[PDB]
């Protein structure tokens, strides 16, 4: 909602404001905004446009690109460690908050379709919270957990225009 507007004003800003290389905070928000849409191609291309000058100047930006390298592999546990690695207050946090929750939803959603049966330890990597916390949650939602083996199972107006058209 709020984020979509924030990409719009920022997208405008990249072309309009600079002499061709814009300042380091603007590029960081923009990169972070591309990850929320999960438009990873344009993200990657964003980093490749970025000169060596911004990479020395700004390290935060390079952290935002690292989450994204993993999103390309689609390896979940790896995503989570990188979210914790870097923070940049104000300028990165509201959009970051959204990134973390967009990948968890993507992960739960992915599993629900993907697997008719999955190991609970693998599932623990996907949501990214330990085994005790996960097994407690799945039960409430209404998914079945098997214990001993520890496996988890996911669960007129048109017509007149058309008649008018054919008769003519």
């Amino acid at each position: 909602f709020s984020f979509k507007k924030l990409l719009d004003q920022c997208e405008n800003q990249e072309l309009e404001a600079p002499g061709g290389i814009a300042t380091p905070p603007v590029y960081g928000q923009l990169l972070a905004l591309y990850l929320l849409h999960n438009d990873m191609n344009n993200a990657r291309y964003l980093w490749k446009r970025i000169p060596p000058a911004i990479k020395s100047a700004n390290s935060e930006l390079g952290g935002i690109w690292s989450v994204g390298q993993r999103i390309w592999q689609r390896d979940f546990p790896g995503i989570y460690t990188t979210i914790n690695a870097h923070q940049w207050s104000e300028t990165v946090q509201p959009i970051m908050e959204a990134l973390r929750d967009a990948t968890r939803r993507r992960a739960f959603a992915l599993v629900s379709q993907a697997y008719t049966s999955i190991i609970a330890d693998d599932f623990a990597a996907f949501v990214g919270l330990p085994v005790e916390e996960a097994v407690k949650g799945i039960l409430e939602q209404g998914w079945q957990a098997d214990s001993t083996t520890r496996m988890v199972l996911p669960r007129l107006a048109r017509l007149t225009d058309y008649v008018a058209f054919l008769e003519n």
Binding site: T160, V163, A164, E167
Partner: protein
């Protein structure tokens, strides 16, 4: 059926001859001289009634109803409306 204003003897004479075809025929009378807005057809049957001890053929009036025939009705629609085609041919949607 016959034509004319109120009931008269010349209708009763003809109704006895009709009694030869079927023993109980209906009589119907239409006034096209009607000064009145309601439906000016009135329906009768004949009764044989004794007056002053002599048996007389006298008429008795019946009320009416409306009834079936959808096949016939769709023609009464066309007959009733008397509408003309516009600029085209009249539309398929319209007619349907």
């Amino acid at each position: 059926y016959t034509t004319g204003g109120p009931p008269d003897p010349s209708d009763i004479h003809v109704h006895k001859q009709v009694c030869e075809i079927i023993e109980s025929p209906l009589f119907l009378k239409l006034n096209p001289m009607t000064k009145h807005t309601d439906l000016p057809v009135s329906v009768f049957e004949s009764v044989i009634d004794i007056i002053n001890g002599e048996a007389t053929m006298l008429f008795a009036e019946l009320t009416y109803t409306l009834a079936t025939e959808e096949a016939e009705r769709i023609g009464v629609d066309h007959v009733a409306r008397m509408t003309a085609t516009g600029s085209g041919e009249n539309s398929t949607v319209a007619e349907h």
